[PDB]
């Protein structure tokens, strides 16, 4: 592998078994992305068809709200993921920009490929819902202190 | 056989009528009546609930004794507090009943004994885990603004 690859298929592997013909396979999916502290890579607006993997560093979703203020839904630290899921999924104009907040070192993925790798590799079913599972209890949370 | 909730997975994964009996005995028919609390905040959360028929809230109690909802689910939908299911420890909401509803339960230990029974199940819940975060991302955007 790399450094990068290796991080997500441990990950995986946490989770899930996987060959290491799956991994090769995983791999060739999600690209290397690294990038300074303070990069957008997600606008408001902007078609979503990217899925983030945090290898090293953070990532932040943020709106603008009517007073033109930056407002941080949530943050997303090594081995958890990040996207404008309603947007991703639905193929749609994002309602969120996402933002490094560290130097990051990301993996990739689009939807179209994600769907391809479900497809491909079935077990990695039980590692997202494991992932969205954890993602959703995450946001629970957020909601009660947001109400706060 | 829980027809309504063999019928919603059947929307995303293909259940043999085998199968949809195997995974239909790990669940129990609940029917209560609307503003029944089913979990307190402090209660160790053991259950996930599938609405057949009704409406659940999530909602916790502030320091000042005023219930914040945070949280519907409606017919065909799950609800748990799910941080506290997942950790199995005492939750933080409140889960009661808004109208009078028919529900399927399920404890996390049956929830995992059953995703290994039926793995067909792992991408049924990826993607209803997936749509609930997804709604919950878009949730906390317009409840600052709207």
Redesign the interface.
Known sequence: SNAMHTALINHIRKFIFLTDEDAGTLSAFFQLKKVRKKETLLKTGEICRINYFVVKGCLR?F?I??KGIE?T??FAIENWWLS???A??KQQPA??YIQSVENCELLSITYTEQENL?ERI?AL??Y??LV?????????????F???
Not at 135 to 141: D, M, N, V
């Open positions: 979703l709106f709200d009517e407002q839904t949530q404008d899921y309603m991703f999924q309602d969120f479900f079935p079913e039980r997202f819902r969205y599972q954890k993602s959703f209890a995450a946001a629970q949370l957020r909601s009660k947001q109400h706060m």
